[PDB]
């Protein structure tokens, strides 16, 4: 059917860039904080399942919280995003997971599919190492981890497809 996927993560980690790279194969360097929520549709086939995904983009800024939380409900998968050149955004992952659970009101929070993205992998000057990120993912629900770059396309499609794969798995 219709698979709702939501992007959460600190302001500026690249949530909007990821959606736009995946859906329209385009990248913009420009600075703009998302205020209101937006979504795009995309069809694809996964493991022999033809699917419509609906990708919800949200405000990362703390102050815009009331503009995103009403749309957590009904999500099928959450893409928690941080940037590898921003340790603070990485350290906020737990709080992001907590926030989603609180507002989405999901019956089984430790069964719910998250996928973790460390974006901006094209930037060589990192603050978060891969092993550190891998370690967090394993010790907080054993979630799939992707190092991505919206700027150069690295693993962007792979990450979204795994999200569908995770949703397909949970239908059992």
């Amino acid at each position: 059917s219709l698979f709702k996927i939501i992007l959460l993560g600190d302001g500026g980690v690249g949530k909007s860039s990821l959606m736009n790279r995946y859906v329209t194969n385009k990248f913009d360097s420009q600075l703009f904080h998302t205020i209101g929520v937006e979504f795009l549709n995309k069809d694809l086939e996964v493991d022999g399942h033809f699917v419509t995904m609906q990708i919800w983009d949200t405000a990362g800024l703390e102050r815009f919280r009331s503009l995103r939380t009403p749309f957590y409900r009904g999500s099928d998968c959450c893409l928690l995003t941080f940037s590898v050149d921003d340790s603070q955004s990485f350290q906020n992952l737990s709080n992001w997971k907590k926030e989603f659970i609180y507002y989405a009101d999901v019956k089984e929070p430790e069964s719910f599919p998250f996928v973790i993205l460390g974006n901006k992998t094209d930037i060589k000057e990192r603050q978060v190492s891969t092993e550190e990120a891998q370690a967090w993912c394993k010790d907080n629900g054993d979630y799939p981890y992707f190092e991505t770059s919206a700027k150069d396309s690295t693993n962007v499609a792979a990450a979204f497809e795994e999200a569908v794969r995770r949703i397909l798995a949970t239908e059992d």
Partner: protein
């Protein structure tokens, strides 16, 4: 009350002398009733202060329109640019165009508008039809229809 479409940085220019104001455009359905809203960014982003919030100049720019008051959408899509749409209302009131950001946002909005009007309403001609792809710049006129 559900959100069918949302888009940041839709510009409207209240007058031609003053620069365009960026805002958030949304489509909402409560029952079968669709309503279009546009809200200037300063009213969303919390940048007016508690004491001024109720009577801010920007509240004079906010729009909310029931879709049933709309008879025509007159859209205009220039290449290497953002589409504009003018809603033509049954009342004859002149409304400023909404200008979308560069990209295919115009069509996306038209598409969510279409998907939401159903099954009681629809765009004429249909978006999927040969007529529905406009005429050449590019210019669209759509009517909202209820069978």
């Amino acid at each position: 009350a559900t959100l069918l479409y949302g888009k940041n940085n839709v510009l409207v220019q209240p007058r031609d002398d003053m620069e365009a104001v960026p805002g958030y455009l949304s489509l909402h359905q409560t029952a079968d009733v669709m309503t279009l809203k546009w809200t200037p960014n300063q009213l969303m982003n919390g940048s007016v202060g508690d004491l001024d919030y109720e009577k801010s100049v920007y509240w004079d720019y906010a729009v909310t329109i029931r879709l049933e008051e709309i008879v025509y959408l007159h859209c205009h899509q220039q290449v290497d640019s953002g589409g504009t749409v003018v809603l033509v209302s049954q009342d004859g009131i002149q409304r400023p165009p909404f200008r979308f950001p560069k990209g295919g946002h115009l069509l996306q909005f038209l598409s969510c508008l279409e998907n939401g009007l159903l099954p009681h309403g629809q765009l004429d001609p249909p978006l999927w039809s040969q007529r529905g792809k406009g005429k050449v710049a590019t210019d669209y006129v759509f009517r909202i229809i209820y069978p």
